[PDB]
């Protein structure tokens, strides 16, 4: 039977059993159940990482140490291995013989407790084809009689889904609910376990670092429970010092190391930003201004919001920024957002809201509920943010979508979290939400029926109020109205488009020269305040690209050669010099 | 154990595993996790083709080279085969005996790090109708203790849909997020792998060709990740050069071959238009005018837009051309489009908008959302 079970008491005496700090009330209840006349089989139901195994194994540590009640003294705790019992039970009845023989040892001792971790497994065991006899059925008579005591550990999902189904077995096991410890309780646990981790890595952990790990992990990590979650940062932190060369520096683990570990585990920007990041961040606005002209107010909001988050003054639970870029057509509402991610080197989560025009389309974002065809697919929005927590969420043409879809973003803007169909909670704390809208374009295009025109810009603001409920608008950091492109900015736009044309020509070996007079002519011919920058490409396409494309395929431009574009004042028509060479 | 698992370290010496280029940051956190006191089982979650198996298999290859840390040195990685473990396990206990034997071997070694690719499968390993005894349940006591180290590789969909549901197993495994590398990083990977591909195909890829494959595949090829995308154009290009020019097969693989391969994979016109295609473009306007008389402006807009796209001056992220043909009935608004497809030999995707007269019909074009009929 020694092969099947491990003596925890003996194990703790020589190497260690990960001692338990605290949990006095939990242990007291378990000891009380063990002392019961009948059904003295305590069960430990709790979430993953709460410390169920530590409590059962910790009991052995306390017994050897002697800090336990007299009734529980001189008690042996054995950890059963389900695999060992079933490893060689090929023949009929072999499993029953081993299981029954092992149980007899416990009855004879009368002071022995069995620890079956992952007790849900015993429910199904030793059933070759149709056999209903199993460890649960074989052990059931003994549990009711109270001859033997068996500690159990199971998760809430495993308990309810499988263990609870067995009503008879559940009756014998007195459920003990383990609840996640507090922040103060966790630091005490780490302090007790600190010598073991320090000896393993030959490192040391400052008191500030221990407190920082618990607090920082709670804020940025929300997929694991506090005891393991804090211990995960402390363990990996020590490895970093060990991994780094001993020659340069290996003294201790400070708060700075803890922040780096949490940042990588959570895939969030590391605190105490490096000089390289700061240089990029300070010049982010200038770079954006080069790409987009006349939208400095929009750029200022995005760059300032990102700066606050890295500086440590960001919202505790809300996203980095909720910006509604409402403006006329072709004013750079999405160019800045598309170029912001490129400058920051983060993934761009671009979602077109025209697809989400129906109320039933909400399932695409959060996934289908359980028991449906699309439950496996999940939510496109939750999956995207989970994979790329630090990213830019661009909801283009949000106004086109159904009003119901806007309600989903309320929790995202306020709590920075969206629950998927499965129940996983996404994090939007580091996501730069940008909802571009074109509401009011028709109102501005409309002309007032009066002797004097009206300021239709204010009319679009009221339309925004009708489309979006006040709660949605209140959550938004600020609504940035993009002004119509002026004549001066249009000249810069033409240069930007010409530069893009040069890149295409550079691949083919062609170099394009455009006189200043020619650039102004193109701008004047295609300058439309309502349409914006987009018609500039049309004039450039028809005037510059169209002649160049005939020659490239059927002329001198086939082989890369420089070309000069000049304006003829006599005819007011652009003159193209192919210069075959 | 030898039958079920394969020693990746041995394969590296004989060249079985390909060289690992870069991925230092991904590997740096992998050794830190493996050095942890408890739950030292790094997991590699990433999209298909990112290089998850390359990093796990590459670690064994890096150990042979000797550029890994001292801790990693003297360690041997074993690739577990789920099929072999569950082969001929009809009798009760064969799976447990084989799995327990493997765990005992790893614990005894104290330096061997297992590598279970597609780790989602162990959650659904051998079990009875109501049996809950699986490899995940059996391995859990050892993973938490830290006696054995197990590397894992599974996709994002599999991790969330299957691995995440088993919270106990997920807790033991420390997820390491792998993302597709940059363009500059991908070319380095191809250069490192270029000798193996060149030897098999007996071709030599030029520096321009390698760079072209990475840049051209990112733009034209979609739904596939960058490492796989570029490698597919390199491997496929080598095969074409080997078999097509039967007489004096071209040793070099110029940029032109790379463009042709990308066109076939993406089913789009190839760059560097050929002479035959050129004649069609100049005569397109004349051909269309003969079939559809009058309406010269319409033909000029369609033909000029196509010329610019083939010439390489087309919009980077917009269609070739968006045109609204508004006119009286019977003026050939649809004939100019039907004939254009025939002239260019491309499929005519004719979608009648009369059917989509209501908002509910939008679901037909883009599909019904998850959890609804259709």
């Amino acid at each position: 039977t020694e092969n099947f079970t491990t003596n925890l008491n003996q194990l703790a005496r020589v190497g260690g059993i990960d001692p338990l700090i605290g949990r006095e009330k939990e242990l007291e209840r378990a000891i009380q159940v063990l002392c019961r006349r009948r059904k003295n089989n305590p069960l430990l139901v709790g979430e993953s990482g709460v410390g169920k195994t530590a409590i059962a194994e910790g009991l052995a540590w306390r017994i050897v140490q002697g800090d336990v009640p007299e009734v529980m003294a001189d008690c042996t705790i054995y950890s059963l291995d389900i695999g060992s019992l079933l490893a060689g039970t090929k023949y009929r009845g072999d499993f029953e013989k081993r299981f029954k023989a092992l149980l007899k040892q416990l009855e004879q001792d009368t002071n022995s407790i069995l620890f079956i971790d992952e007790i849900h497994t015993i429910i199904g065991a030793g059933a070759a084809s149709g056999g209903q006899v199993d460890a649960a059925n074989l052990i059931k008579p003994l549990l009711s009689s109270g001859k033997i005591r068996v500690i159990g550990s199971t998760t809430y999902q495993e308990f309810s889904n499988i263990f609870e189904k067995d009503r008879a077995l559940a009756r014998r096991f007195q459920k003990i609910d383990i609840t996640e410890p507090s922040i103060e309780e966790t630091v005490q646990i780490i302090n007790g376990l600190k010598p073991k981790y320090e000896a393993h890595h030959d490192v040391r952990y400052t008191a500030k670092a221990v407190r920082a790990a618990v607090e920082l992990a709670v804020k940025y990590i929300n997929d694991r429970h506090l005891p393991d979650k804090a211990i995960d940062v402390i363990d990996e932190a020590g490895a970093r010092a060990r991994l780094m060369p001993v020659s340069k520096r290996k003294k201790t683990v400070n708060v700075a190391d803890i922040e780096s570990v949490v940042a990588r585990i959570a895939r969030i920007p590391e605190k105490s930003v490096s000089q390289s990041d700061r240089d990029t961040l300070k010049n982010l606005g200038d770079r954006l201004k080069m790409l987009v002209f006349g939208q400095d107010k929009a750029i200022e909001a995005l760059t300032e919001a990102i700066k606050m988050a890295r500086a440590g003054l960001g919202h505790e639970h809300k996203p980095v920024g909720s910006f509604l870029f409402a403006g006329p057509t072709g004013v750079g509402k999405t160019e800045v957002t598309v170029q912001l991610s490129k400058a920051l080197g983060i993934e761009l989560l671009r979602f077109d809201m025209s697809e989400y025009m129906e109320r039933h389309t909400v399932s695409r974002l959060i996934g289908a509920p359980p028991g449906y065809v699309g439950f496996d697919q999940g939510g496109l929005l939750t999956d995207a943010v989970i994979k790329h927590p630090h990213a830019v969420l661009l909801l283009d043409e949000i106004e086109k979508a159904h009003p119901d879809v806007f309600n989903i973003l309320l929790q995202v803007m306020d709590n920075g979290t969206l629950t998927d169909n499965n129940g996983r909670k996404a994090d939007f704390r580091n996501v730069v939400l940008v909802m571009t809208t074109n509401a009011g374009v028709r109102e501005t295009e409309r002309k007032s029926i009066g002797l004097i025109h009206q300021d239709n810009s204010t009319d679009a603001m009221e339309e925004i109020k009708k489309i979006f409920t006040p709660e949605f608008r209140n959550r938004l950091d600020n609504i940035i109205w993009f002004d119509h492109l002026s004549t001066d900015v249009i000249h810069q736009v033409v240069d930007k488009f010409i530069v893009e044309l040069q890149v295409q020509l550079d691949q083919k070996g062609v170099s394009l020269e455009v006189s200043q007079e020619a650039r102004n002519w193109l701008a004047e011919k295609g300058y439309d305040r309502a349409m914006g920058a987009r018609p500039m490409a049309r004039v450039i396409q028809d005037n510059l690209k169209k002649p160049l494309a005939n020659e490239l395929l059927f002329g001198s431009l086939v082989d890369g050669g420089q070309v000069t574009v000049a304006l003829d004042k006599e005819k007011n028509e652009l003159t193209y010099g192919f210069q075959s060479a | 154990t030898e039958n079920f698992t394969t020693n990746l370290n041995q394969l590296a010496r004989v060249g079985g595993i390909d060289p690992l280029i870069g991925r230092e940051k991904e590997l740096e956190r992998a050794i830190q996790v493996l050095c942890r006191r408890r739950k030292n089982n790094p997991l590699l979650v990433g999209e298909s083709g990112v290089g998850k198996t390359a990093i796990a298999e590459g670690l064994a290859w890096r150990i042979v080279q000797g550029d890994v840390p001292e801790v990693m040195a003297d360690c041997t990685i074993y690739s577990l085969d789920i099929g072999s473990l569950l082969a001929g396990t009809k009798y009760r206990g064969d799976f447990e005996k084989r799995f327990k034997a493997l765990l005992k071997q790893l614990e005894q070694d104290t330096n061997s790090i297992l590598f279970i690719d597609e780790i989602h499968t162990i959650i659904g390993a051998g079990a009875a109708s109501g049996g809950q005894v699986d490899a995940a349940n059996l391995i859990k006591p050892l993973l938490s203790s830290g006696k054995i180290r197990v590397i894992g590789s599974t996709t994002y969909q599999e991790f969330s849909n299957i691995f995440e549901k088993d919270r106990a197993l997920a807790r033991r495994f420390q997820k390491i997020d792998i993302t597709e590398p940059s363009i500059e990083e991908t070319v380095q990977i191809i250069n490192g792998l270029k000798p193996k591909y060149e030897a098999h195909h007996d071709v030599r890829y030029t520096a321009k060709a390698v760079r072209a494959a990475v840049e051209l595949a990112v733009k034209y090829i979609n739904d596939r990740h960058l490492p796989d995308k570029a490698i597919d154009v390199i491997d496929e290009a080598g095969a074409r050069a080997r078999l097509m020019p039967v007489s004096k097969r071209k040793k070099t693989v110029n940029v032109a071959d790379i463009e042709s391969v990308v066109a076939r994979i993406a089913r789009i016109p190839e760059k560097s238009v050929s002479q035959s295609d050129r004649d069609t473009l100049k005569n397109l306007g004349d051909r269309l005018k003969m079939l559809v008389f009058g309406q010269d402006k319409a033909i000029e807009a369609l033909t000029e837009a196509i010329k610019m796209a083939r010439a390489g001056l087309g919009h980077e992220h917009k269609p070739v051309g968006s045109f609204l043909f508004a006119g009286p009935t019977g003026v050939g608004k649809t004939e100019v489009t039907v004939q254009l497809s025939k002239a260019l030999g491309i499929e005519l995707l004719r979608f009648d908008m009369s059917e989509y007269m209501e908002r509910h019909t939008v679901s037909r074009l883009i599909g019904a959302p998850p959890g609804y009929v259709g």
Partner: peptide
């Protein structure tokens, strides 16, 4: 518009069978 009808996805239970041996003598 029109009403939206949802469709469920039936899931059937599947199981395997183990074997127990018995030496003749």
């Amino acid at each position: 518009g029109k009403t939206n009808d949802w469709l469920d996805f039936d899931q059937l239970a599947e199981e395997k069978v183990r074997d127990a041996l018995k030496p003749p003598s």
